[PDB]
């Protein structure tokens, strides 16, 4: 039970038609995120802000890795003669953080798993209406099988008859994947 893994994971990706570029740099411990760097702002963002009281990371190293990783992306695009792979659709889990009691505060978790590439937005609805107050979206966590996963969190106070949904729009997809959840 006693092994642990620290991972520095980075990715650089781009789409044509439409044209868009993305980048991520994070540290991960076992299944959990330590931090990611906001590459625009050269800012380390700890997954739990208390981690920042015990350690620091200079984003300089991430800015250097981003530059070389974007160039390596163009090298692999040319050496592969622009070879591409099939997208893999997200699988959704939708569950509360805690034991549900009506009119007591809680957090609904939408977990998108086993998808590729790591581009996916979550949309929350309550009784068919879009809700977004206090929502937190995670960065993309890798898997040994080279697919990705992501978490979104909706703070909620449940009423009898509420119906919650999480919809995941994966890049290029003709429609979202969706899951519904009801209290009790």
């Amino acid at each position: 039970d006693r092994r642990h893994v620290l991972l520095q994971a980075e990715f650089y990706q781009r789409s044509e038609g439409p044209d868009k570029a993305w980048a991520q740099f994070g540290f991960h411990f076992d299944a959990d995120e330590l931090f990611h760097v906001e590459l625009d702002a050269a800012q380390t963002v700890w997954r739990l802000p208390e981690f920042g009281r015990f350690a620091s990371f200079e984003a300089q190293g991430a800015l250097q890795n981003m530059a070389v990783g974007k160039q390596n992306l163009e090298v692999m695009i040319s050496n592969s003669n622009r070879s591409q792979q099939d997208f893999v659709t997200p699988e959704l889990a939708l569950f509360p953080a805690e034991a549900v009691s009506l009119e007591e505060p809680n957090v609904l978790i939408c977990y998108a798993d086993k998808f590729w590439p790591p581009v996916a937005t979550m949309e929350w609805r309550r009784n068919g209406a879009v809700v977004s107050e206090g929502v937190y979206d995670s960065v993309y966590y890798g898997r040994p099988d080279l697919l990705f996963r992501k978490f979104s969190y909706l703070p909620f106070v449940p009423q009898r008859g509420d119906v919650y949904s999480c919809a995941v729009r994966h890049w290029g997809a003709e429609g979202p994947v969706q899951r519904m959840w009801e209290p009790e």
């Binding site: 620290l6 994971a9 015990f54 620091s56 034991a99």
Partner: protein, 206 residues
């Protein structure tokens, strides 16, 4: 203290070479495997294009190994550069051990107690059967033992356990359901053992 980056920036060599919609992905992963704290550490590098690992580096071997043909030029190119390989072996010893020393107290030694709720529902079909749910939430690390006891004796049969589920915020949850026909006088107890508890939690039903 300040954590160290677990690679040095390394450039690939262009060398084959060359409808409208397209997607391209490039990943790099640097892993310190702590097999026995810092007494035994394996450092890996992995380079990925789309969904394929082109080339990797194992600190135990000390050279790049191509996994596909797209990685064979890069492995051969990097393997001829003694500075690259020496820099990488320095990180593989220094950085893994340095990062572990900083992280240990709040990761390896993170300890958050489980909360335990016991409840019961009738099953969705006759004959009459009770589903006793032991719902365990908020704990770290994910390793936990959650067992049902009937009249002081551990129940094996008709126990269904979900996987320990990741909440994604450094806490975990699990659900263990015992299907049973209760008789009067029967005492059902959920017992939860976890590294964070001085003594097991015992929560009885009704």
């Amino acid at each position: 203290m300040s954590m160290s980056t677990m690679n040095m920036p390394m450039a690939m060599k262009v060398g084959g070479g060359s409808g409208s919609s397209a997607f391209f992905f490039c990943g790099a992963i640097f892993e310190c495997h702590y097999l026995n704290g810092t007494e035994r550490v394996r450092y890996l590098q992995r380079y990925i294009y789309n969904r394929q690992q082109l080339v990797h580096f194992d600190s135990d071997v000390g050279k790049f190994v191509a996994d596909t043909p797209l990685g064979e030029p890069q492995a051969e190119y990097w393997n001829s550069n003694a500075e690259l390989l020496e820099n990488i072996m320095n990180i593989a010893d220094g950085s893994c051990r340095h990062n572990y020393g900083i992280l240990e107290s709040f990761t390896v030694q993170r300890s958050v107690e489980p909360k335990v709720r016991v409840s019961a529902l009738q099953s969705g079909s006759l004959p009459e059967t009770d589903r006793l749910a032991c719902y365990v939430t908020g704990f770290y690390p994910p390793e936990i033992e959650v067992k049902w006891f009937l009249n002081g004796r551990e129940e094996t049969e008709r126990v269904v356990s979900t996987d320990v589920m990741q909440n994604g915020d450094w806490t975990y949850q699990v659900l263990v359901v015992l299907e049973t026909v209760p008789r009067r006088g029967d005492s059902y107890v959920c017992r939860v053992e976890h590294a964070s508890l001085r003594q097991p939690i015992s929560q009885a039903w009704e």
